[PDB]
Symmetry: C5
Subunit: 295 residues, 5 copies
Amino acid sequence: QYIWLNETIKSNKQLAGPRGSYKRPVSVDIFRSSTILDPDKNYLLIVEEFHLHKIRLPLFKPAGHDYQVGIFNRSTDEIMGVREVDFSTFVDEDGYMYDYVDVGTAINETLAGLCDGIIGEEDIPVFSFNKHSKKFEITTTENFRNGHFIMFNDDMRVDFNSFEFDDIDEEYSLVILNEDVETQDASTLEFLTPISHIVIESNDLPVSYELLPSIISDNTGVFLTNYKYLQQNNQDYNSILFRVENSSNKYHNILQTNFNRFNLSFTIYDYDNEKHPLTLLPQTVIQLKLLFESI
Amino acid sequence: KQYIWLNETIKSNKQLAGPRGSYKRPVSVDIFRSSTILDPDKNYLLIVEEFHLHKIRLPLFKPAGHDYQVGIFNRSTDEIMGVREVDFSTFVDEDGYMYDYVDVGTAINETLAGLCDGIIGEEDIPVFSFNKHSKKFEITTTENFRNGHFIMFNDDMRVDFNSFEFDDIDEEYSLVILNEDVETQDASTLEFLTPISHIVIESNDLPVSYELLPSISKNTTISDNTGVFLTNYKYLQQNNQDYNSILFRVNKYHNILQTNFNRFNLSFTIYDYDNEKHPLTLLPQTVIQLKLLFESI
Amino acid sequence: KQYIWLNETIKSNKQLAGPRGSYKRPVSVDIFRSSTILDPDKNYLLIVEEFHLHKIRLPLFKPAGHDYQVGIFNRSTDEIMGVREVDFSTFVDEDGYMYDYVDVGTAINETLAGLCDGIIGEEDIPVFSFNKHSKKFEITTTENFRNGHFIMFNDDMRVDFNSFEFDDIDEEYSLVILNEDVETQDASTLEFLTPISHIVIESNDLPVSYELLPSISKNTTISDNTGVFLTNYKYLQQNNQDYNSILFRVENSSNKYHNILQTNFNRFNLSFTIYDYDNEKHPLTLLPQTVIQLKLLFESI
Amino acid sequence: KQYIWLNETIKSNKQLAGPRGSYKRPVSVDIFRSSTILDPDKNYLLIVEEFHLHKIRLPLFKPAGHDYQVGIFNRSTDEIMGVREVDFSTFVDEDGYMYDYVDVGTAINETLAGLCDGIIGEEDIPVFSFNKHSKKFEITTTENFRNGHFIMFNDDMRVDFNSFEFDDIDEEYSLVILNEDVETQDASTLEFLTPISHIVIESNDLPVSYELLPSISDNTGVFLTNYKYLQQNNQDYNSILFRVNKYHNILQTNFNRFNLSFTIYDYDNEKHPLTLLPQTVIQLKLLFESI
Amino acid sequence: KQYIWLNETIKSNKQLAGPRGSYKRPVSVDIFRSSTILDPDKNYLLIVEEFHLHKIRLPLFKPAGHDYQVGIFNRSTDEIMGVREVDFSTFVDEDGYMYDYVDVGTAINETLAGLCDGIIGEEDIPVFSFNKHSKKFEITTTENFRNGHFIMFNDDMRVDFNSFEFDDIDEEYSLVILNEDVETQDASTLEFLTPISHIVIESNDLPVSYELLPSISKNTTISDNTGVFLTNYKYLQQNNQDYNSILFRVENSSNKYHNILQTNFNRFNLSFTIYDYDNEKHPLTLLPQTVIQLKLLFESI
């Protein structure tokens, strides 16, 4: 026996707020007059599909990183200076950033402020994001490359690993520049994104919880599905579509048969395990299809 | 274990469909057999193995669901010169749909040209357009416009054409950051413009178990609402193609409640993102194919 | 559970198939075993695990299906100068097929040129054609033609060459919007032209359950009809390739099983058959160079 | 329900395989265990979960299969000037194979050049060649050649190099239409030219249910797996990876020894083994699944 | 029937793993639950659903495995002028690995340049190098070098850099055919250079059935060897990326189940291990920025 349950959420300006400023969590109450399941049977739950049409996800989270840029002199053979990359001007209230151009601007302003006293404005290097290639780029003069190197610390080195590097120190590495415009060997947006996965969870649905580590552990958490997210490009706004294939093992046992209501909520888990709820926009449309399959 | 396969097909012509499909005839099939289809002692599941909607027409855009507004900002005086609501009424068909993204771009452009009429000199009027080859919208401007003015997109414009670079200025409006004569999107956004969500096969008289639905009443939460659906095909708009040939090939089972039938109807239906349903209709050139599998447990 | 695999092959040559496969010999395989294939005590499901139609020729267009018409509009006088039906009769072989999209483009171009022969000067006659590289049709015009006139497509032409930009004048006719000297399609429309729907393996003497089909009559809905179908491969015309090498392999956990009814047999025939969109069936014919592989599975319950 | 996995591997060296695999040592593994593999009471199915043929060499062409012929037509006189057969014998190895599509393009070009040697001058001799970048064969000509002459392909050339535009003059020969200096193919046709049909793992001593084969017939042949090979590019040396309901019945559950070979079937069905190289590292993972 | 889901995650920092992961701490996690995990009466299978090795370093080349040799040939005198062995020792790390194909290109180049020292002019010395953009090795030469000489690759080089156009002269050595200033490979060969074969999850103290391995010894061809393996991720080197973010999800190849032998347990240890093509094993090691995620399915029968 296959029991199918469709659900939808609309939105508008009045429910969500301008630019979704009310941060209303994505949630649906399911509520039926009749009972949903047959008392004499045992049911596995699986989420067959969902569609998160028109939502806004963050692209970068400064708190998790400790970036540091520096300048190295080739004649004198020493470190001239090192500065910490200051994101506080570009961050929203919740500690997020929504554009990889701005990650590049932050890194650039730190780099420009460091070379203010030391190097002439003609040769101050420029760090920027290229919208077309999805790659960060370093733009420099020939005078700069003969005189100096740009230095990255390890956090920078790892997240922007597609540049060519030379290790000088336990921490710091030199960026090897051979041309006016130097770009990344490969995109590294996967390394920058804080989003790990999006999850459907219910406080009141009688379903066997998944086993977790501690905040030794006896900890548990309700998870109906587990969507792994990957930042493909610089798109702040997204339309995320999920559909299972022929033999997905992603079932969950239902412990009690007799219920006529429950709540479903969409939540985002970051790479540092800070969970936060997915919120509506005026234009958001959410769709959802649960299967209850008898054993 | 038993595999009963039921093929079915619809040919079309000008008589059935009308010129350009103007009769709006629903896609539908009666399957009528002399013998009974299923064996009385078994229980069966139903899955749609494949279908083909060869030569059909689908809408590319539905203006009713959007509130697009463009505006001009003056950098010298640092204030809003005007804001106008984009008017799609001269581009829309009788059922509220549009069928070309070049036309979506023209609609936006004419609003922009009307808004700039007295306020900016003709040579410096910016041009909004859809690029057929890249499937991206573009803004074309003079350097003299860029030094003087910004184009303003409201929140709905902001979201649906999100791959331009923006700068917020208040609760509602956002400035389009232009640095070159031709400025284009970083990424196609046709998925944000299409109104078509899914195509569904349904039936009024096939003895098959319903799916549970949220209530018809949009305010109330309680629901005893159901509906027959045999399959659920998610549609994604890949490009600027009005006319399509949709092909589907195959967990998606449905229980058959009673065994004693030889008649049923099948109808293809389109659901939009605003949940309004409407029938898939024929063209003269439409050919439709369909394959059901009744599978015994 | 039991798995009984049955590999099979077909070779060919000039004598068997004829020059360029001109004898039209159907692809057919007598399987014949000395021993009985299946064990009497068990029930068996049949699935075609893979095949390979190496080096065959399929048609790309079938003029019978289509009612193409082109016209010329005059923008000065704002009326139709003329309209003509597109005639393929010279390009078509015996069977009613065409085998190259360059020819499809030529036939439309001829019709268009013959329509402009009296009226418009030879220097700015428009040129319809098929671009081999992009797999897209193209309209080549002069600026003088564009200012003066429009090319008209009818409803059938409109649908099958849908990627051009169009303005609809009438219930029937549409004007092709041209802004530049060489105008092309937004997207490939070869899927709208290929007459091949699917390719089928059917046996005239294998004890296997038949698929239910709709009635032969256009007038009656009540159906008794049935057909033998072992597999049903959906074909899609990717490019302008006349000759093809078609390979099918069953994905993990498909449902394309048929019940076998009788458990006692040691011979059966397998033909390969092509269905078109108009439901006209015709057999897959050999070439001299045609190798054909095939692999059935008989799976017990 | 029981899953019993059997990892296996092969290594190699100069002394085992020879310079450029010149010994032709077949790929083979003797599995031999102290304990009995399977339970005596149960029934088992055999599926090959994954194999990796790392650093191997496979032929790209086999002239034996093909009967190519080229010709020159004259447009002024309107008649066939000559027809020569394409001789591959200079580029072929001992086993009848060829290992690069540029050499396939050269062989046809030498035949084409030899046919125009007496008739047309060197300035207008057409040039047949393989483009390494596009994976497509090209015909280079002059304007003087195109106005005067055509190039004739026979039916076997016509089917394997089908992407060119053609005009049929008779039952065997077809003119290649040419409008520019460098004319090329509509699409890649390496799938036509490759003689490798599939790659098979076959035993000679394992108790497993055989697959029914043709010859009236009563033949049978043991095959543990079947990998369908397709030629993606002009890469002579390869690294073939396979990961997976391709099951087989194990007839007897009392054994602890068998010999797994690797074999290459061609489109003419002529079978031959997969030979090692010094650098080769072959991997394999069988599954025994219970009922 | 029952589906028990076990989630596990690992974080890191400077103190834990060391600057650039200098301490080489292996990736390992202890699962310790106060309750028993499984129900006594049922029989459970184990499959790994998904893991995510976020921000980790992996080697791209392992010189020990190869014996590369380069040579110079003289076209005038028609003989070998010399053959040097490619020395990687100045580029390798402590553990025998190289983390950049640019550096593999330089190694070959230094060897090639040193071999031309006495014999060829500074301008006409050929240059071998890796192209970051195309992922292909290139040979930059003068017209004067090509008219006078050829570069010679031994068999090991010939295989791993097979996409150049070669010509055999003897059993070991092969000329590289060069017709332009810059000559590139026809296709990528990074698959031929990577030493990482697969990444593996294993456990010393989980009661689960072991897989059957071949013999440790060269002498006795008979085997008795077994190993504990929870999953087997086949790795493929896409590009020149030193640092990686490896995601696995069981979508297809879902046969990778393992029989749990004992139901009575509440604790085990999961460790990540890398196997190379010479079958040497070494652990996966953390970095300060590494985050590892894991999900296990215990499924009953």
